[PDB]
PDB file of C-alpha atoms and ligand atoms in Angstrom:
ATOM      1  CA  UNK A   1     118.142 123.775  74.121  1.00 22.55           C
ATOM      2  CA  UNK A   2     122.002 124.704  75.969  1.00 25.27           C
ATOM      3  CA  UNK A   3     122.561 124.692  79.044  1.00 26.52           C
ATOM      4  CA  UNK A   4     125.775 125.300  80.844  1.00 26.72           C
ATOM      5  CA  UNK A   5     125.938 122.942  84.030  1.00 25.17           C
ATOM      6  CA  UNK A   6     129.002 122.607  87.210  1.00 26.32           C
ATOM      7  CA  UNK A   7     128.659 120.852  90.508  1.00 23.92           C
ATOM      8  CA  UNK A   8     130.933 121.141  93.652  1.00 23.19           C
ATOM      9  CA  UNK A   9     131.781 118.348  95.797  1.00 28.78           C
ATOM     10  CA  UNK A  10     132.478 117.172  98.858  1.00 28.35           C
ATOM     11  CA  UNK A  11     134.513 114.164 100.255  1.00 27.81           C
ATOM     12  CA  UNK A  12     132.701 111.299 101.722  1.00 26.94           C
ATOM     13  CA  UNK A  13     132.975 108.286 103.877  1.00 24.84           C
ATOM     14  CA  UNK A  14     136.832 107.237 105.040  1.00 22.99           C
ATOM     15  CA  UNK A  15     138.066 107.675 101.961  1.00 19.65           C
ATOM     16  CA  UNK A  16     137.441 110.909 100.715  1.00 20.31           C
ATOM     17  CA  UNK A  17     135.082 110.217  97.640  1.00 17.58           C
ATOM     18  CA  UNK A  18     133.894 113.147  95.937  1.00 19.01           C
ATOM     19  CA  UNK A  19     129.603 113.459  96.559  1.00 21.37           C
ATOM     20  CA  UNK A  20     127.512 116.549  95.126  1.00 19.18           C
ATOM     21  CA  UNK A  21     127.361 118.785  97.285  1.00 16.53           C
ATOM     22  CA  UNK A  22     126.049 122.055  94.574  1.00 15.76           C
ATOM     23  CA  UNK A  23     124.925 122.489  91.410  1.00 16.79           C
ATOM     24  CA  UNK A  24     124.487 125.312  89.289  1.00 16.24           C
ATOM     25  CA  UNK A  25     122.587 125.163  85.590  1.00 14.99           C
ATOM     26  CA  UNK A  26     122.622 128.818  83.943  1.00 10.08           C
ATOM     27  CA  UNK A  27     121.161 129.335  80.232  1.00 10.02           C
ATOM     28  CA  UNK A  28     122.871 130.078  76.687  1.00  7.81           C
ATOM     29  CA  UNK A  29     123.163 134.033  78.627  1.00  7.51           C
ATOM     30  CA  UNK A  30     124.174 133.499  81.849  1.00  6.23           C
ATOM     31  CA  UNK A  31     121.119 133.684  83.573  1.00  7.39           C
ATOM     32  CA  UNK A  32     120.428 130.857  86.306  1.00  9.28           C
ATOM     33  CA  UNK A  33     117.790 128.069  86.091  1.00  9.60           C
ATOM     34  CA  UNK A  34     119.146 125.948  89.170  1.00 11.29           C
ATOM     35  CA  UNK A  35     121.624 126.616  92.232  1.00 11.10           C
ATOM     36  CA  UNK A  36     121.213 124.425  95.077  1.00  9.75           C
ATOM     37  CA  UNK A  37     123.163 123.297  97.896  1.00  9.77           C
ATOM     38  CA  UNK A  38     122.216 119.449  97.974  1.00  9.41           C
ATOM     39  CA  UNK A  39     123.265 116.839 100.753  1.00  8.43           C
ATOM     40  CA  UNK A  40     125.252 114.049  99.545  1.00  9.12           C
ATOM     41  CA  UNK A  41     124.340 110.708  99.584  1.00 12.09           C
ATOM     42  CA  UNK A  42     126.777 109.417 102.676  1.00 11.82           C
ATOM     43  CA  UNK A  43     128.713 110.805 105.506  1.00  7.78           C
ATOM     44  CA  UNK A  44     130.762 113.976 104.807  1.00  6.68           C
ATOM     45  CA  UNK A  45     134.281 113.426 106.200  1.00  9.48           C
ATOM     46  CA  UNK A  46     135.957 116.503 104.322  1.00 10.77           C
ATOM     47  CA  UNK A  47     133.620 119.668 103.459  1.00  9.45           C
ATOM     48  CA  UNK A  48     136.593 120.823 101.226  1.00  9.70           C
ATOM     49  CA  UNK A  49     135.478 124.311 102.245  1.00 12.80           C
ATOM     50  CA  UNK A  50     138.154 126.469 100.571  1.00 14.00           C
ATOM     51  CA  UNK A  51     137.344 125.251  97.102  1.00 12.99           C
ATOM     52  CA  UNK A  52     133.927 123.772  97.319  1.00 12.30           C
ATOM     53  CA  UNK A  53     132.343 126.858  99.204  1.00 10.02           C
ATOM     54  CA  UNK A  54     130.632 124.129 101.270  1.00  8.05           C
ATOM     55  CA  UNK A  55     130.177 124.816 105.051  1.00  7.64           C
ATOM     56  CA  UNK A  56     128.428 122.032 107.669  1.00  8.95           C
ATOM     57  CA  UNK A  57     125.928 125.165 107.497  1.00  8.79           C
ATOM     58  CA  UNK A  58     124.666 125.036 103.877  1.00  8.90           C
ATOM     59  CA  UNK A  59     124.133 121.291 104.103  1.00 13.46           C
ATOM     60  CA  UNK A  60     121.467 121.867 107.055  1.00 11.26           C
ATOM     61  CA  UNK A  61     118.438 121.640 105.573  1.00  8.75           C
ATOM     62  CA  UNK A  62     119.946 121.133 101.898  1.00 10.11           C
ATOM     63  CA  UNK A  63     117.876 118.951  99.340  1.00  7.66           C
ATOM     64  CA  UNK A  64     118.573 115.592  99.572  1.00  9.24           C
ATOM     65  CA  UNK A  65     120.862 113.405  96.685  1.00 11.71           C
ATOM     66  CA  UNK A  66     118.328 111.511  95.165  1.00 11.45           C
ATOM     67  CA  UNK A  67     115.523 114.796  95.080  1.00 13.70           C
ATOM     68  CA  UNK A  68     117.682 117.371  93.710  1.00 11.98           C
ATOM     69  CA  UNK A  69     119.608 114.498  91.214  1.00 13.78           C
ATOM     70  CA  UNK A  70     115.614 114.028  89.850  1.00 11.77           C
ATOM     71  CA  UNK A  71     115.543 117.846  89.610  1.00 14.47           C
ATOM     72  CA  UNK A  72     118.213 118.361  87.679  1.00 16.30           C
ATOM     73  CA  UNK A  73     118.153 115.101  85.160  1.00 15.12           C
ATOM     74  CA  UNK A  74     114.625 116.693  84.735  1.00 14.23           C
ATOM     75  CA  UNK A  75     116.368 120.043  83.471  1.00 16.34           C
ATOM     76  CA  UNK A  76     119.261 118.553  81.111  1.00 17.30           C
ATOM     77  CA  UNK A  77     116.737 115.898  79.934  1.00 17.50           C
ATOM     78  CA  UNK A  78     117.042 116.189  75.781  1.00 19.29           C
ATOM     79  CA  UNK A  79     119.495 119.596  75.531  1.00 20.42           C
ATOM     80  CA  UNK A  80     123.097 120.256  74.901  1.00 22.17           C
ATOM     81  CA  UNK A  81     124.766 119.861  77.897  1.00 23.57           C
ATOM     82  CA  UNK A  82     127.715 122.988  78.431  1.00 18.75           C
ATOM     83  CA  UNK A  83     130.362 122.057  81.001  1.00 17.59           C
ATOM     84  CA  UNK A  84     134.292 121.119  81.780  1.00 17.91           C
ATOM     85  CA  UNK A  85     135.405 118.108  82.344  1.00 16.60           C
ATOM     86  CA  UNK A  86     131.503 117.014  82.459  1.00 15.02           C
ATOM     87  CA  UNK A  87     132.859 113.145  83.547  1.00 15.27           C
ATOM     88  CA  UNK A  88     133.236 113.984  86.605  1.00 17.62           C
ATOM     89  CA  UNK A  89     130.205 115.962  87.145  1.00 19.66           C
ATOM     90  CA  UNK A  90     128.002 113.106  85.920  1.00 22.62           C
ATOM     91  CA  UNK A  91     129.609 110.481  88.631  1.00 19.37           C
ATOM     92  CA  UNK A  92     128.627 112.985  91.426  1.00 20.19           C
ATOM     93  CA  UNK A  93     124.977 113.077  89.497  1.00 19.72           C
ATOM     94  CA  UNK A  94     125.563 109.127  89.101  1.00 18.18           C
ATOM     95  CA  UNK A  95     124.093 109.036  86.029  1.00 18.53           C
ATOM     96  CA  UNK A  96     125.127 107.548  83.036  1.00 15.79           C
ATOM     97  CA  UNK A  97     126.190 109.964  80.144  1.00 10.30           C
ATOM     98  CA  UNK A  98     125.566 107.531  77.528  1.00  9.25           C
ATOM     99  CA  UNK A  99     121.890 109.173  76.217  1.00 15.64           C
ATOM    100  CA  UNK A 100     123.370 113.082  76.757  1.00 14.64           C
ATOM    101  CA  UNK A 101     124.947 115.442  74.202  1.00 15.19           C
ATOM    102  CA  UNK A 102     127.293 117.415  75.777  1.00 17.18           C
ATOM    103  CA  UNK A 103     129.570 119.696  74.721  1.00 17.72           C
ATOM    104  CA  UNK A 104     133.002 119.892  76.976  1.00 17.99           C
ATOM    105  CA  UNK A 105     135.364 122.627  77.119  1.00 18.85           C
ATOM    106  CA  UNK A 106     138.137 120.644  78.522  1.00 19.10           C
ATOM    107  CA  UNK A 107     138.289 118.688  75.276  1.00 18.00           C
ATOM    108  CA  UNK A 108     137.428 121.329  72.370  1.00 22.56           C
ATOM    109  CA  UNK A 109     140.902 121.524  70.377  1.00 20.94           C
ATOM    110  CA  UNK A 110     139.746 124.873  69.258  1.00 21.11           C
ATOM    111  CA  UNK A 111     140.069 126.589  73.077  1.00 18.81           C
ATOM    112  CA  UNK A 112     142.962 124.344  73.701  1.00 16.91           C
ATOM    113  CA  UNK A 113     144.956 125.733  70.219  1.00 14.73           C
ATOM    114  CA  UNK A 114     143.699 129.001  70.676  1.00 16.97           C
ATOM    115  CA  UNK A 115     144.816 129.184  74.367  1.00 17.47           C
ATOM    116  CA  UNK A 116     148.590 128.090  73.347  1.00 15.65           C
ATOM    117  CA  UNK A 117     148.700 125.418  75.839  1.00 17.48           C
ATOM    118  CA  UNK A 118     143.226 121.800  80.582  1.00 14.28           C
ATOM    119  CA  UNK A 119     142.081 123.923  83.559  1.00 15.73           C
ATOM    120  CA  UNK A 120     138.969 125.645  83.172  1.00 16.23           C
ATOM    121  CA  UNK A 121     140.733 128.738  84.808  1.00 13.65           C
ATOM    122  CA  UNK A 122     143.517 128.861  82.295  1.00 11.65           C
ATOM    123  CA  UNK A 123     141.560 128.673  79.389  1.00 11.08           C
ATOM    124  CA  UNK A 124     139.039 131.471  80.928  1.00 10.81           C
ATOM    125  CA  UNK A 125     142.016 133.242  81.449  1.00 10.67           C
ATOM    126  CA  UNK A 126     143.560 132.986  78.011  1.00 13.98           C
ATOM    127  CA  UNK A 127     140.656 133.178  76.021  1.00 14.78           C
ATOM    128  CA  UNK A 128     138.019 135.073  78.134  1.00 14.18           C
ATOM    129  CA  UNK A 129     140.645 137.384  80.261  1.00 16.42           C
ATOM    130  CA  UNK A 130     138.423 136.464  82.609  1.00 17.69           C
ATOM    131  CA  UNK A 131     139.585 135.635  86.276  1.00 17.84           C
ATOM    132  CA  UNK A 132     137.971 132.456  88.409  1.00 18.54           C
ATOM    133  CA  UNK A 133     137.689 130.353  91.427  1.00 17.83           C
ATOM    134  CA  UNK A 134     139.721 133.305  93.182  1.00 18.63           C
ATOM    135  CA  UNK A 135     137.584 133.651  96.115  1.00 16.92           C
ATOM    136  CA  UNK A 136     138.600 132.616  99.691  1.00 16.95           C
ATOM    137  CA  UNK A 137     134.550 131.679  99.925  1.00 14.77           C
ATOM    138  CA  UNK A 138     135.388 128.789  97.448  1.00 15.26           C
ATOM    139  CA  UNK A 139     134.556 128.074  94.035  1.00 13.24           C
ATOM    140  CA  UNK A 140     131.117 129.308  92.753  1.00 14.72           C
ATOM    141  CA  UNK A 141     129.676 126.921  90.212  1.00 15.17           C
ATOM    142  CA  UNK A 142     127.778 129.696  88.795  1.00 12.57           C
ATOM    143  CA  UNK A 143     130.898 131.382  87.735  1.00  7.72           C
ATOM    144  CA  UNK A 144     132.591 128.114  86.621  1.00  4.57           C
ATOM    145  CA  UNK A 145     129.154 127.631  84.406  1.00  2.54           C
ATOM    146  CA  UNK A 146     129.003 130.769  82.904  1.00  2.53           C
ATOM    147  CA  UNK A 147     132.696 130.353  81.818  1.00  3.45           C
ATOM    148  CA  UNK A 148     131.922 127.619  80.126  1.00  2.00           C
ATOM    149  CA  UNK A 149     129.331 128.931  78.921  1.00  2.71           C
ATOM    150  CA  UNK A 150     130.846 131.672  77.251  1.00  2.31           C
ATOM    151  CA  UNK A 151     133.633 129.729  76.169  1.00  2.00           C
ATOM    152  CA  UNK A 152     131.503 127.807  74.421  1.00  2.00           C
ATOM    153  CA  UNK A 153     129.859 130.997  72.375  1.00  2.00           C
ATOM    154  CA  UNK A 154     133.426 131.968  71.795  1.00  2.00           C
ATOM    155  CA  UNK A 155     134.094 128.522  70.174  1.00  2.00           C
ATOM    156  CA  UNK A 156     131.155 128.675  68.022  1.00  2.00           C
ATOM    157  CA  UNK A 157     132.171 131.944  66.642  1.00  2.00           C
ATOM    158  CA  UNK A 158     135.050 131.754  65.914  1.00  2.00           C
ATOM    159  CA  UNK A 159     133.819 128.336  64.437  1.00  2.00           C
ATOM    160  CA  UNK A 160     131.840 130.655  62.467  1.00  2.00           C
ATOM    161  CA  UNK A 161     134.632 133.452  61.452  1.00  2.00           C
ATOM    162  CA  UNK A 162     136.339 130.572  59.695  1.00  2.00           C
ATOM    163  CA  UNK A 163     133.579 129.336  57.678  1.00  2.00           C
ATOM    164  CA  UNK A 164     133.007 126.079  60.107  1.00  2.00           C
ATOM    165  CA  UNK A 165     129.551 124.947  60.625  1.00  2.00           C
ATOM    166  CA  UNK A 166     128.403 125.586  64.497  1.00  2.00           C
ATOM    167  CA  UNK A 167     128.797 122.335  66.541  1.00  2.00           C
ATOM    168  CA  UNK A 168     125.728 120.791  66.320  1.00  2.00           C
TER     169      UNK A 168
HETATM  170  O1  U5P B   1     141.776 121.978  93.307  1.00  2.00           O
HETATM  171  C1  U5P B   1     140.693 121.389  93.330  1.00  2.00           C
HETATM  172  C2  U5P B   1     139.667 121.471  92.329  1.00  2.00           C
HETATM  173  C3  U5P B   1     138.515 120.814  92.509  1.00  2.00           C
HETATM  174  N1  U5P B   1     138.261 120.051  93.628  1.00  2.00           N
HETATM  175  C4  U5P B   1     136.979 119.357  93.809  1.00  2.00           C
HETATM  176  O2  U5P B   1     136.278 119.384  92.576  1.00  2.00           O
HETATM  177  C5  U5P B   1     135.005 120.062  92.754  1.00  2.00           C
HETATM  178  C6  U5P B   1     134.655 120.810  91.492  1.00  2.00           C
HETATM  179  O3  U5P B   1     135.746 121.667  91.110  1.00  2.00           O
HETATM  180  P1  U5P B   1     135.539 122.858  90.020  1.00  2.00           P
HETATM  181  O4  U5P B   1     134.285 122.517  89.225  1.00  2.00           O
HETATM  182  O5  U5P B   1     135.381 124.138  90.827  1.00  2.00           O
HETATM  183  O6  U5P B   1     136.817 122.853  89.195  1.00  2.00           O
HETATM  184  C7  U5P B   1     135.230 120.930  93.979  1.00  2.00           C
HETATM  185  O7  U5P B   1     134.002 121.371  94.563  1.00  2.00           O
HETATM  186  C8  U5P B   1     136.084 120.024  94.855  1.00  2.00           C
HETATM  187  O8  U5P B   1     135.323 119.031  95.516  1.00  2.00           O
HETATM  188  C9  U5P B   1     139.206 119.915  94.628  1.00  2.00           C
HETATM  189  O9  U5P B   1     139.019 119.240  95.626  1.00  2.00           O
HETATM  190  N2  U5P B   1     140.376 120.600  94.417  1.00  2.00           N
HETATM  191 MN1   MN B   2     133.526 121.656  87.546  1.00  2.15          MN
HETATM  192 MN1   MN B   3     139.498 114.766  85.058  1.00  2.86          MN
HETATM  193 MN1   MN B   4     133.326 124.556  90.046  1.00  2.00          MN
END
């Protein structure tokens, strides 16, 4: 019923506009349900490479926008959606966020006290002493899931160690 979701984006048309490019859905363990490289819906005028991951290679022959956007409503269709910053992930899905329950690291006060401060790799730094989005290959959105992921099982315990209900 969780499920931890990121997306990495490319820039399109002549000004730059972040479009999907990947997205990566991974369980309440870790384990991966989706990864795909998907084509945006426009033209690509900056691959953002460095921190995207995405080469003019992966989108050759990548599922098109409106397929793998079907595919992956289909998968966070009625569960608790995991994710940072999950706005901006939803505008590359272009779909409203209205019906979902999400849960979003970026704005759960408990990670943000506990971390003394919101980046995703500061707070899995802080609170997971876990190191991200390091690689010269780019961001992978299956690392950026999982840390939200298991920032999110390290809010709900420590929820729990304090005698707070679990977030719902
Ligand atoms: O410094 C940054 C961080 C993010 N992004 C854009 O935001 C997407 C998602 O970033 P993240 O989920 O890895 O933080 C990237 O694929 C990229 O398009 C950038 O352009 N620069
Ligand atoms: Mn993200
Ligand atoms: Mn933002
Ligand atoms: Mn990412």
């Amino acid at each position: 019923e969780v499920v931890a979701m990121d997306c990495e984006m490319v820039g399109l048309g002549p000004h730059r506009e972040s479009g999907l490019a990947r997205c990566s859905l991974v369980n309440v363990h870790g384990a991966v349900l989706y990864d795909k490289f998907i084509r945006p819906e426009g033209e690509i005028t900056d691959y953002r490479t460095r921190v995207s991951g995405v080469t003019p290679q992966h989108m050759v022959g990548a599922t098109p926008f409106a397929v793998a956007r079907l595919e992956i409503l289909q998968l966070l269709k009625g569960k608790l959606v995991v994710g940072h910053d999950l706005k901006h992930d939803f505008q590359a899905l272009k779909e409203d966020m209205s019906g979902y329950t999400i849960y979003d690291t970026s704005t759960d006060r408990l990670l943000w006290r506990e971390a003394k401060l919101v980046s995703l790799r500061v707070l899995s730094e802080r609170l997971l002493h876990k190191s991200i989005q390091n690689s010269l290959l780019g961001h992978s959105s299956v690392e950026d899931a999982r840390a939200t992921m298991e920032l999110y099982q390290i809010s709900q315990r420590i929820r729990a160690r304090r005698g707070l209900p679990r977030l719902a």
